[PDB]
Structures are given as structure tokens and as C-alpha cells.
Amino acid sequence: SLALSLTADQMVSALLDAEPPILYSEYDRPFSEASMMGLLTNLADRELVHMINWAKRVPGFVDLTLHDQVHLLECAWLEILMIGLVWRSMEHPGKLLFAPNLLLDRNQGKCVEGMVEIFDMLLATSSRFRMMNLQGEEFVCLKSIILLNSGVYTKSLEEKDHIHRVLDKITDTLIHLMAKAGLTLQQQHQRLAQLLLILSHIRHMSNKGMEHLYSMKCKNVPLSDLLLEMLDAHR
Amino acid sequence: SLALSLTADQMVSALLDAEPPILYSEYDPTRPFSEASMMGLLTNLADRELVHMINWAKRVPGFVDLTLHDQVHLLECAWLEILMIGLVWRSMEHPGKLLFAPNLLLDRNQGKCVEGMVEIFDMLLATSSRFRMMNLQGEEFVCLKSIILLNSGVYTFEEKDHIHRVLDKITDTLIHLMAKAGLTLQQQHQRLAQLLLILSHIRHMSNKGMEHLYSMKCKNVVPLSDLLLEMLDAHR
Amino acid sequence: HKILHRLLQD
Amino acid sequence: HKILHRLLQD
Ligand SMILES: C[C@]12CC[C@H](c3cc(F)c(O)c(F)c3F)C[C@H]1CC[C@@H]2O
Ligand SMILES: C[C@]12CC[C@H](c3cc(F)c(O)c(F)c3F)C[C@H]1CC[C@@H]2O
């Protein structure tokens, strides 16, 4: 059972408790292209280890085979990292809070070739979160949706529908939070739509990021074996 | 306003009536398929569909209210998405096959002729099977296709606020359709979520399709029209 | 200029 | 097997 027995409040509290910690960077003194890529990828690699523990605490995820778990994390890992980054950077307009000791504005994305286009997309998403006044309870719901949805496309004894049952539960949970916040029925549906359309942009940013990360890897500009494997799954 | 003053039923009628026709391919059954020839076929089709899409977009409520530069940007960002959701939609009642055209119905085995394309066919086929599993309705389809047009490039930007009002209105329209179909209140927001989550997959397929198309162009596999070259150049 | 830009006016 | 495989188990 597990997931489907949870109430809307239990879902929220479970997702909140499962949240990973905010890690620090190696930073510092000024940057170079190799140095910048070093800090960012190092950070991502350590966050990845924490993400995996977090995934196993997302309700319904442990009920999946190890094959399906791998496939989902392989597909969604950069989306999960990015929505996290975007969430952390909410209260810092025009800046990306990769870490408490690593706060990068737009211009510093130019330190690495082609990265500024990505920063711009991340920043605009953060500005959108801010504009919507996105709440923490909503954020952890969206991040879980990304995990379960992004690769939900494998004939046998599915399952798959159980993932769609869990997905429906998280939808109910989001609505519950909005109805609790005093939103009218019409406002609930609209806000839900707005939040989920953001997931389309996050997917876009992840695809672009995967292209860029692969471009830097395929030119020897030094990634961990874990990162290389995560990167090899998108090719 | 105008676009905002519409009812839900008026929103649907306008979209259904703005639908582009089903086009044919230049498929010749006298000759076998090569990698170059099928790429030629598929891109020739896409190019002709693009012209109709442009005239369709102008009939999407609120789109003409935007500046010419915003119209260009939205179409540049979403064009392959819009093609793919259309393809996936008309392939619904053809399990295991992609109906690019009435005279061009392809399964995954025929995708293998072009390197790297069968992976893209597989994704498109999975999405089509998903629409079929959900029993996606035409009224829902035209709403989704419009949402893609207005949303996909809206964050690469006070008229940005105008787009969101239109997007909100399509949301109101979607819910309206579900309520009229008999769906309970809970089923309404659940289905709304299910439909919108598909757009993330469609975005993904467009991104993979975009770089694959770029790959073929840079290998001189297929000559792309000046329009397609310009649409393609917008993503890099 | 851009073809798309022109087609959006015709 | 894969690193990701190992991490999910452990
Ligand atoms: C090296 C990159 C730098 C940004 C990105 C990234 C890193 C993080 F540590 C993080 O927490 C995060 F959310 C995030 F998006 C990862 C790659 C993608 C393309 C870039 O070149
Ligand atoms: C040539 C490709 C073949 C498929 C694709 C495409 C063509 C259509 F005419 C269409 O109506 C449609 F929906 C569609 F997706 C376009 C490019 C993307 C990647 C491939 O290389």
C-alpha cells in the first residue's frame, strides 16, 4: 500500500520531511571557465547522492522495481536539480543560489561558453515562481511530479497505472493546498494549470542543460563516474 | 479584450473552426525508401504544414493582440511541438503507427531507415497510445495545442500578463468541457493535470526532434527549405 | 528578413 | 552494476 493511504496533509508532511539538505560549494578566488564548470558539476554530483535518498522517500517510489526507479531518476535528475535551484533563487532576483556561498548573477554565466542562455532560462523561471508567490508545499509537490512523470513511458504487468494513481494523489494534494489557501474553485484550476505548465519549461531547460553538459564533457573541459552515467542515459 | 470576452463554448468553436487541414505527402510507391528520401518526405510535409500553422496561430484568440516579434518568437519556440501533438492526435486510431499523412502511415520499423529516428518514433507512438488510453477528445486537443503555442516561449520573454489571462481562459474552457462530459469535480482537476503533464513529454520530443533534424541538416542528408532552416536556427 | 515575419503579415 | 543501481539499493 503505502502512498495511496496517505491523506493530503500526510502527503505534504511526508514530502517536506523528505527534503534534501542545501549543500555548500568548494568556492574560494575569481573564476575561469574550467573552474566554474568544476564548482557546478561538483555541486551537482554531491546533490545527486542526496536526491536518490530523497526519491526513495517520495511516497509510492519504493513500490517500483529497481529498473523503473533507475529509469525515472536517469530521465528526471537534472529537472529535479534545476527546479531546486530555481526554488532556492526565488528571493534573489536576477541571481542563482547554487549554494549559500555560491550566489551567481547573470553575467557570471558568461564565464562558461553557452551557459548564459541556460542561466537566463533558470532566472526567468525563478522570476515566474516569485510572480506566482510559489509556496514550499507546492514546490515539493511539483518536484515529486517531475520524478514520477518525466520518464513514465517504459507491455507486461504494469504497474505504470500505479504511478498514475500516485500522480493523481499529488494533484489532489496540490488542490488541497489551494483550497486551504482560500482560493475559489476557478482560481484552484487556473493555478494548478499555471504550475504544471512550468514543468514544460523545466523539461526544456533540462534538455538544453544536458546538451550543454554533454558538450563540455565531450571536449575535456572532469566529471564523476556517476555524472557520466547519468549523462550517457540521455544519449 | 475580445479574446477574454468569449464564453467557453465560443472559445471551443473558434479553435475547432481554426483547425488546419490534413495534408498529403509526396510519397511515391514506385521507389523504395532511403534515409535521404524519407527525410526529404517528412521535412517536405512539415514545411507545407508550417504555412497552415501560421494562419492557424492568427486565429488563436489573443495571438493577434501580440506584437509581430512576440508572434515570431512563440511560433519559433513551439512549431515542432504543435506539429507533433497534431501528428500524435491524428495517429490515435492507428495503434502502432504514425499518420503523418493519409498516404504516409509509418510504423517503427520504417523509422529505422533514418538513423536515430526510431527513438523519436517510439516516443511519438507512446504519446499517441497515452491519448488513446485517456480517450482524448477533439475539443481537448485544440485547447492543448493552443496552450503550447502561447506557453512554450512565454518565459523566454504587461502583455506577458495578457498571455496568461488567455492561458487561464483556456484552462476555464478545459474544465468546462470536462464538467459537461459528466466528470466529477475531482476527476476534473485530475484529468486537467494528466493532460497538461503530457505537454512536458511533447516538449521533450520536440527537443529531441530538433537536435535530430539539426544533425541531418549538418550531414547534408536532406535539403531544408529556407523557412525550416530559419525555424531550426532559432533553437541555436 | 525572416520568412516567418513576412508570412505573419500575409 | 551501474552506480545508480548501487545507490538505490544502498
Ligand atoms: C554545468 C551545468 C551547470 C548548471 C546545472 C546545475 C548544477 C547544480 F549543482 C544544480 O543544483 C542545479 F540545479 C543545476 F541546474 C548543471 C549543468 C547543466 C549545464 C551547465 O553547464
Ligand atoms: C524529420 C523529423 C521527422 C518527424 C517530424 C515531423 C514531421 C511532420 F511533417 C509532422 O507533421 C510531424 F508531426 C513531425 F513530428 C519532423 C522532424 C523532427 C525529427 C525528424 O528528423
Numbering used by the authors:
A (entry chain B): 305 to 332, 335 to 460, 467 to 533, 535 to 548
B (entry chain A): 305 to 461, 470 to 548
C (entry chain C), D (entry chain D): 687 to 696
The authors write:
ERα contains structurally conserved globular domains of the nuclear receptor superfamily, including a DNA‐binding domain (DBD) that is connected by a flexible hinge region to the ligand‐binding domain (LBD), as well as unstructured AB and F domains at its amino and carboxyl termini, respectively. The LBD contains a ligand‐dependent coactivator‐binding site called activation function‐2 (AF‐2). AF‐2 binds the signature LxxLL motif peptides of coactivators such as NCOA1/2/3 (also known as SRC‐1/2/3). In the canonical model of the ERα signaling pathway, E2‐bound ERα forms a homodimer that binds DNA at estrogen‐response elements (EREs), recruits NCOA1/2/3 (Metivier et al, 2003; Johnson & O'Malley, 2012), and activates the GREB1 gene, which is required for proliferation of ERα‐positive breast cancer cells (Ghosh et al, 2000; Rae et al, 2005; Deschenes et al, 2007; Liu et al, 2012; Srinivasan et al, 2013).
The 2,5‐DTP analogs showed perturbation of h11, as well as h3, which forms part of the AF‐2 surface. One phenol pushed further toward h3, while the other phenol pushed toward the C‐terminus of h11 to a greater extent than A‐CD‐ring estrogens (Nwachukwu et al, 2014), which are close structural analogs of E2 that lack a B‐ring. To quantify this difference, we compared the distance between α‐carbons at h3 Thr347 and h11 Leu525 in the set of structures containing 2,5‐DTP analogs (n = 3) or A‐CD‐ring analogs (n = 5). We observed a difference of 0.4 Å that was significant (two‐tailed Student's t‐test, P = 0.002) due to the very tight clustering of the 2,5‐DTP‐induced LBD conformation.
